[PDB]
Design a protein around this nucleic acid. Structure first.
Lengths: 155, 82, 122, 80, 129, 205
RNA sequence: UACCCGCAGAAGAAGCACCGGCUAACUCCGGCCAGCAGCCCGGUAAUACGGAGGGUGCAAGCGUUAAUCGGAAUUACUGGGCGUAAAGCGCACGCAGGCGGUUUGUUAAGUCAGAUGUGAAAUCCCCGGGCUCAACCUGGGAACUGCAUCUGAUACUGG
RNA sequence: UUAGCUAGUAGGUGGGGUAACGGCUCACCUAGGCGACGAUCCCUAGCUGGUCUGAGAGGAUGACCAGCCACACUGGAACU
């Protein structure tokens, strides 16, 4: 019972001897809403087939996120090719302050309160890749506590 | 001279005076030395409309500061009520 | 830039140049029609754009567009111009229809306030 | 116990007076770097006791000329 | 030339951690030993020893958990080109408290939370997350 | 400063009953509720994110009969208050005087409740208050004036409200034609088909 | 005068912009002309011109223009770059300037801590109060992130 | 795309002058003083609490209200 969200549909084209060959690419994201989120990207000669391929690729290739009561553990920075992403944990009641692709990722991921901002290029594919890379690199107090070989009294 | 008087603040038709110690040459709502209370002339008698400090007022009167007629009446009524 | 290079020469904020310099930070400017004529658009488009040249009260002489269908504007006509360019290179101002020499576009029923047309009473 | 300053003497060509440069370490208000700032003062030096380079302790007084309002208290280090 | 040996120590730690080095060695110094003490008591390095008398050589034993780097990030904040000093009410917290900020207060080199509990500020040496 | 035009058009556009009619019938018997207004009402186009946010804000506004300036000020005060912005907004919306008078049972619709309030027929703590946006505080007593207790409007409204559900924060006596505002309603007491976070995202963009 | 009371009768009181995408809102009718355009339509079935019907958004207002900031991380201190997109001086020596290996002692200038004085009132923010509500007025507090002085700390920078 | 500026100019002694210190003024003597941390020159401009915007840092701004300054047809001057 995971939530699936179509982020962007784009029409690309390859040229051949006869003319242009138009195909469609769809970027989606799925997530169970409590710390697991994955994005899929499918190209197809039609829009519904592209969305189906994106959903199948997104249902696999899902990552785990260490949430903290529905928000981030700490401010994180995600970077892909052109997009640099900043996410920050907020208090209860603020919502998701983020762009379209960031909103989709953080909403299907299970994040409820976050202050986010996208720098550089706002390309949807690179934005969702940067968001996923920033969320999977976010660690919890138990992780750092066990990695430091000392109790979790820092929490 | 130095005088203790009222500065008519508030809105239209609803005045609110601030008992200020000011050099008598300045404007009414202008430069003053010290605010020693207030006076709300349209108070509902349910709340307080006369909270002018008598300690600093007496200290300034002891230094030659003059008391305006309205402030003198206010001091008299504050002493009578309290 | 190195912090020392900024200490010696700070950041120079890029200055923005106005797109309607003849108004001189005024919403409208009055001027007299020096020459009323028509112009052909640029490339893709093809028409005969109604335009006029007007010497403003501050001495500036600018070309101003005359929107709407049909206008009774001759030389020495004292009109009111406002910002707003025509994408007709060179023209950077619009003539306010219904402003002290430019009559409103007749037979307007929609978007009348943009062309100075009184409301048709039933 | 009196509020005073301290700087080095950069000029003593004038008679009964010296020019003391008070160097201070101030953080830049924008870029946060700690930059040096120099305050040159015309100081009254009676007896012509201070030479160039002396680290002297000065204090403020009444105006003694058009540009002199500080006077000498004592010399700490003496031009060597 | 070598104008920042503390940033050099941080860079040596970072490069030895990225290269999966077992231990890193460097010329020793009092401030380097204090920062290494702060890192060891917080659990970012295993151990450290100073060998040599006329030219002391500091050797830090790097730490790994799952074949992964224990020190994810280590940055120099206050540097020779720009010194950063903070008061006790504005001491920074790294990783929203999960990381440490090595602060040099008048009572020695300590972490940011230790300087906060001691009611002290000072020079922010580095961030270790 | 008021909406006076067709009422069922709003509920048809929102796709949901907005209680803009008294309740002598079902809305299905007075209009095509499942069809949007106008010549192109049969079509349903895919709404954007801004479309959904705007439509939810408009649904709440048309429910409470609040124009845009007052609703913007309501959101400003809710974001100023401490706590979650959405329930603060809905509580500020429910605290209005005409809303309470309607919920109290003295109005068949919020329009006739607003007419009762504005026409100086409603008292708060014995003081005739004729402001529809008057924020009603806890423990306040709301009653019909002696002169307006003779109107059949209030009787029909009382009956129509008895055939409705009873709010938990209102202690009303139909005989004395008076009621008491006990407390502000929590988020769980209002309708569950109102997404306050949509309005928060619309007004915070 | 505020406010209150009585009378009569829905009676005296709704407009503006928009509907190709960005951006909520679609159909009919009249030829790259007339025209629209904030950035990317019209050459004879134009949701983009003009009119009508319908709808959308605001509402005693609604739009356009002018102006500032934001978005613009697009002067990047927070918070950018320079092989090919704009950007490494043709190369070097070198004064001022910037920075500077390591240990000890000393100072306490930078730094840090505490206290005092000051930082006008209004304004901003918080809890209340009075105007039938609000705007508005107002009590108290917080704040005024600053400067100076005095007393200490000595890890780091400086002498 | 303004680099040199300054002769009462910088300081000292003495006389005068002011309510008051002071080249404020005068006589004489010394030869200095300012400046690359931007002197001099040129253009623009009342300053502040504050206002608008911004998450903040900042950017823009200085109408109303309050404090300070300057002016009173233009230039000069003193009297009470």
């Amino acid at each position: 019972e995971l939530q699936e969200k179509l982020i962007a549909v784009n029409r690309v084209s390859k040229t051949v001897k006869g003319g242009r060959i138009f195909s469609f690419t769809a970027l989606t994201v799925v997530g169970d809403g409590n710390g697991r989120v994955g994005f899929g990207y499918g190209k197809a000669r039609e829009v519904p087939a592209a969305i189906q391929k994106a959903m199948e690729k997104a249902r696999r290739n899902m990552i785990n996120v260490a949430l903290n009561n529905g928000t981030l553990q700490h401010p994180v920075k995600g970077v892909h090719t052109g997009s640099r992403v900043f996410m920050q944990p907020a208090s209860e009641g603020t919502g998701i302050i983020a762009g379209g692709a960031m909103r989709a990722v953080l909403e299907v991921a299970g994040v409820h309160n976050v202050l986010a901002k996208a720098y550089g290029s706002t390309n949807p594919i690179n934005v969702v890749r940067a968001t996923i890379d920033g969320l999977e690199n976010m660690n919890s107090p138990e992780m750092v506590a066990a990695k430091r070989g000392k109790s979790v009294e820092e929490i | 001279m130095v005088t203790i008087r009222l500065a008519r603040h508030g809105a239209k038709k609803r005045p609110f005076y601030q008992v200020v110690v000011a050099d008598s040459r300045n404007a009414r709502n202008g430069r003053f030395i010290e605010r020693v209370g207030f006076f709300n002339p349209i108070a509902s008698e349910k709340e307080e409309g006369t909270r002018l400090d008598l300690d600093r007022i007496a200290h300034w009167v002891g230094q030659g500061a003059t008391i305006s007629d309205r402030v003198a009446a206010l001091i008299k009524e504050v002493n009578k009520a309290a | 830039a190195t912090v020392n290079q900024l200490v010696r020469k700070p950041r120079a904020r890029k200055v923005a140049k106005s797109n309607v310099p003849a108004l001189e930070a005024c919403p409208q400017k009055r001027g007299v029609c020096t020459r009323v004529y028509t112009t052909t658009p640029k490339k893709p488009n093809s028409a005969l754009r109604k335009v006029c040249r007007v010497r403003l009260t501050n001495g500036f002489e600018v070309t101003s567009y005359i929107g709407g269908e049909g206008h009774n504007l001759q030389e020495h006509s004292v009109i009111l111009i406002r910002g707003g360019r025509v994408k007709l290179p060179g023209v950077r101002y619009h003539t306010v229809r219904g402003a002290l020499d430019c009559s409103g576009v007749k037979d307007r029923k929609q978007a009348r306030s943009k062309y100075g047309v009184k409301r048709p009473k039933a | 116990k009196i509020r005073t300053l301290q700087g080095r003497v950069v000029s003593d060509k004038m008679e009964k007076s010296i020019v003391v440069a008070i160097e201070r370490f101030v953080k830049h208000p924008i870029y946060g770097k700690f930059i040096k700032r120099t305050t040159k003062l015309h100081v009254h030096d009676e007896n012509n006791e201070c030479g160039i380079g002396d680290v002297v302790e000065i204090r403020e007084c009444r105006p003694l000329s058009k540009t002199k309002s500080w006077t000498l208290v004592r010399v700490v280090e003496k031009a060597v | 030339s070598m104008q920042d040996p503390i940033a050099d120590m941080l860079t040596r730690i970072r490069n030895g951690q990225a290269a999966n080095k077992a231990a890193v060695t460097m010329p020793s110094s009092k401030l380097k030993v204090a920062i290494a003490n702060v890192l060891k008591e917080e659990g970012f390095i295993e151990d450290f020893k100073v060998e040599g008398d006329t030219k002391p050589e500091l050797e830090l034993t790097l730490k790994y958990f799952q074949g992964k780097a224990v020190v994810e990030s280590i940055q120099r904040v206050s540097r020779p080109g720009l010194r950063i000093y903070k008061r006790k009410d504005e001491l920074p917290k790294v990783m929203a408290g999960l990381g440490i900020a090595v602060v040099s207060t008048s009572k020695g080199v300590m972490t940011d939370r230790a300087a906060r509990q001691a009611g002290l500020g000072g020079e922010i040496i580095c961030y270790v997350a | 400063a008021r909406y006076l035009g067709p009422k069922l058009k709003l509920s048809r556009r929102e796709g949901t009953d907005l209680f803009l009619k008294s309740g002598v019938r079902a809305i299905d018997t007075k209009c095509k509720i499942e069809q949007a207004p106008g010549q192109h009402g049969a079509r349903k186009p895919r709404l954007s994110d801004y479309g959904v946010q705007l439509r939810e804000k408009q649904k709440v506004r048309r429910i409470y009969g609040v124009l845009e300036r007052q609703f913007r000020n309501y959101y400003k005060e809710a974001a100023r208050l401490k706590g979650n912005t959405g329930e603060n907004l809905l509580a500020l919306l429910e605290g209005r005087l005409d809303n309470v008078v309607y919920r109290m049972g003295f109005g068949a619709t919020r329009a006739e409740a607003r007419q009762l309030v504005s026409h100086k027929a409603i008292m708060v703590n014995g003081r005739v208050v004729n402001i529809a946006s008057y924020q009603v505080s806890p423990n306040d007593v709301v009653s019909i004036r002696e002169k307006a207790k003779k109107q059949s409007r209030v009787k029909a409204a009382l009956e129509l409200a008895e055939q409705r559900e009873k709010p938990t924060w209102l202690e009303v006596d139909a005989g004395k034609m008076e009621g008491t505002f006990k407390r502000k309603p929590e988020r769980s007491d209002l309708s569950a088909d109102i997404n306050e976070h949509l309005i928060v995202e619309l007004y915070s963009k």
